[PDB]
């Protein structure tokens, strides 16, 4: 985002023979950006576990990662403030 501004000037009292002083103005700006970052999580298994474990535990794990996502975004929005 870029936020510009312009300087400003005023009139002069006139006269019968002479001419006015000249006026100029100049631009300037601030600018702002948005941060970006990457976040990771893992599940790791042994071959014996994936042979012997209930498939419902894997679906429960996936659901809990999808919950940990919504927690992360909220913390990083509140950190911004």
């Amino acid at each position: 985002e870029k936020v510009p501004r312009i300087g400003q000037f005023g009139f002069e009292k006139a006269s019968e023979f002479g001419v006015p002083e000249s006026k100029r103005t100049e631009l300037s700006f601030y600018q702002l950006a948005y941060d970006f970052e990457d976040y990771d999580l893992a599940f790791r298994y042994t071959w014996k576990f994936l042979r012997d474990a209930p498939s419902s535990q894997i679906k429960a794990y996936h659901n809990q990662a999808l919950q940990a996502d919504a927690k992360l975004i909220h913390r990083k929005v509140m950190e911004a403030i």
């Binding site: 002069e12 009292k13 023979f17 002479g18 001419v19 006015p20």
Partner: protein, 137 residues
């Protein structure tokens, strides 16, 4: 006296008047300067003599006046004379009294040369940088 040739670009300048000038001064020519506030006074200010001024009518303090450094002034004569009467001498140099701003043909070491006359009634204005002689013998 009246302005006849005036050049707005470096021949003269706008400035505010420091005090009222009355109709008793209308059509007289005075040498003028700038006071420490940035306004026009008779004689030298802080600036030394800055230029010459004619007003055709009285003017209030803080109104703008056009001071002349280079140009032609017609219907000219010494400041102590009566306007439209008692004109200048032909072919002679004219000097400001730095104290009163009065202009006459008498030279003096502390005075400032303002110009010279081409025929009796026309003064060629070209104001000097400073006094005639800052180091008398």
């Amino acid at each position: 006296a009246r302005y006849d040739k005036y050049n707005p670009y470096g021949g003269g300048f706008r400035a505010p008047l420091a005090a009222d000038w009355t109709d008793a001064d209308a059509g007289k020519l005075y040498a003028v300067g700038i006071n420490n506030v940035g306004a026009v006074v008779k004689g030298a200010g802080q600036s030394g003599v800055a230029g010459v001024l004619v007003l055709t009518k009285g003017a209030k303090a803080g109104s703008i006046v056009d001071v002349m450094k280079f140009g032609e002034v017609v219907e000219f004569g010494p400041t102590s004379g009566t306007p439209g009467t008692d004109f200048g001498a032909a072919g002679t140099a004219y000097y400001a009294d730095t104290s009163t701003g009065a202009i006459n043909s008498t030279s003096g070491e502390a005075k400032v040369k303002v110009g010279h006359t081409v025929g009796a009634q026309r003064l060629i204005v070209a104001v000097a940088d400073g006094v005639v002689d800052p180091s008398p013998a």
